[PDB]
Amino acid sequence: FSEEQTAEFKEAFQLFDRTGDGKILYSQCGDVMRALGQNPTNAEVMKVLGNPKSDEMNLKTLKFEQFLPMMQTIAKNKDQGCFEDYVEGLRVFDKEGNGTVMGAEIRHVLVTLGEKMTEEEVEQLVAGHEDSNGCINYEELVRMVLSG
Amino acid sequence: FDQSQIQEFKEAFNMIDQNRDGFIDKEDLHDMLASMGKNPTDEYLEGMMSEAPGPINFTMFLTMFGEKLNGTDPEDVIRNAFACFDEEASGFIHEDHLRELLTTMGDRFTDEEVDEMYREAPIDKKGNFNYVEFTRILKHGAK
Amino acid sequence: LELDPNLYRIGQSKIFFRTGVLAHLEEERDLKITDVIIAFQAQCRGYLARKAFAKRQQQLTAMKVIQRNCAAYLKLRNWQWWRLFTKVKPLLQVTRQEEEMQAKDEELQRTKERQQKAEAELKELEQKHTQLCEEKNLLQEKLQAETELYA
């Protein structure tokens, strides 16, 4: 990437230290990349960190110079998501073909399947988009995460 | 600096020159500092003129004063830096939260530095910390 | 799905299918579902993380702003040249109230001149409202009659 935006990435990297020795933990690494606009799976981040265990994730440290090629690897992926695929998977839970999924089902699927969110992560995501019947339009819910 | 600051500064210069002409020398400081209280040592009479790269006339003192007030931030920046820690509009950033922000979670001030900071900003001890009057004290307009 | 016509047959309500062929359209079922889930993968986490970051990525440079002022305060305060200014400006009020004494007793001369102006000015206005009582009726009388002459 150009030096222009690489200079911004230096400012953002310095804004995730909580101490002062200029190091970002392996545990923090995905959410630094997400701050800089990227949307990577946990298994995409983990792979570029060499597959560490949970214990050493809290103890292993990155500097900017070694964080920066990780940003360059995950920046060109071989795919990315859209709107067209993402509504199709949430429409399976649209009980009669309403255009709406029940807020309990949507909380339950994101926690139970795949990259398994916490109860907190789903509650923060869906709140205020579920109506008087507790029903969430999947169309605008996808637009909310994607467009930002 | 501002026009009001220039008038106060011009009157301060005119009461820190002690024999006039239109310069300030060692003796001007040594007599006046004795008159307004307890003088420092001669070391700090000498070390107060070697800040200035030329003779300590009104312009040189104004540059020396103005330059060493240049590297600071406007009060409104401080006001909307305090008012970035409150979520509710009762903008008193309470101690023992504000303590951690200075003593462990920022560029972390040592025990001496925090004692001076909370001595010249009234943590009463019984009355709680506060906000913008410890931005005015920090800048000028109070003490 | 370009199904071969030997693999299916079409009935009246149902589609008959050769052995295996349902289970491929089926595998698909486990496979198809477990990953296009699998997703939300970091679209939701990727949204939440940057929103949580921007609970202080508006704090970014306003912040720090406190600390470098606190750092400037102690080191401004405890360096020598400013220690003189710190006590001299409080003395300038005893002497900037001395400035205020000169301004005040000068103002007292202007202050009694306002009292002298105001009584005279009120009488001048009282006289000219008496006249402007007369002006309002006579100009109104003139204005009507002038229109009657125009007709």
Molecular shape of chain A: elongated
Residue fraction in strands of chain A? 5-15%
Q: Give helix % range of chain B.
A: 40-55%
Q: What is the quaternary state of this protein?
A: part of a larger assembly
Strand arrangement in the largest pleated sheet of chain A:
1-2
What's the total count of β strands of chain B? Answer: 0
The biggest sheet of chain A, with number of strands, parallel, antiparallel or mixed sense and barrel status, is: 2 strands, antiparallel
Q: What structural class do helix, strand and pairing data of chain A support?
A: mainly alpha
Envelope shape of chain B? elongated
The description of the largest β-sheet of chain B is: none
DSSP strand (E) fraction of chain B?
A: under 5%
Rg of chain A (CA only): 18 Å
* Fraction of residues in H or I helices of chain A: 40-55%
Task: Tell me what you see in this structure.
Chain B: Residues 4-39, 73-108, 109-143 form the EF-hand domain. Chain B: Myosin regulatory subunit that plays an important role in regulation of both smooth muscle and nonmuscle cell contractile activity. Implicated in cytokinesis, receptor capping, and cell locomotion. The structure is cut from a larger assembly and holds chains A (148 residues), B (143 residues) and C (151 residues). Chain A is mainly alpha-helical and 148 residues long. Helices cover 53% and strands 7% of the residues of chain A. Chain A has nine helices and four strands; from the N terminus they run H-E-H-H-H-E-H-H-E-H-H-E-H. In chain A, the strands form two sheets. Chain A has a two-stranded antiparallel sheet. In chain A, helix 7 packs antiparallel against helix 8 (119-126). By secondary structure, chain B is mainly α. The radius of gyration of chain B is 20 Å and the shape is elongated. By secondary structure, chain C is mainly α. Helix content of chain C is 65%, strand content 4%. A two-stranded antiparallel ribbon of chain C has the order 1-2. The longest helix of chain C is centred in the C-terminal third of the chain and has 56 residues, at 95-150. Chain C starts with 7 loop residues before the first strand and ends with a helix. Classes of the chains: A mainly alpha (148), B mainly alpha (143), C mainly alpha (151). Chains in contact: A-C, B-C. Chain B binds chain C through residues 8, 11-12, 15-16, 29, 33, 36-37, 40, 44, 47-48, 51, 64-65, 68-69, 71-73, 77-78, 80-82, 84, 101-102, 106-107, 109, 113, 116-117, 135, 138-139, and chain C through 58-59, 62-74, 76-77, 79-82, 84-85, 87-89, 91-92, 95-96.
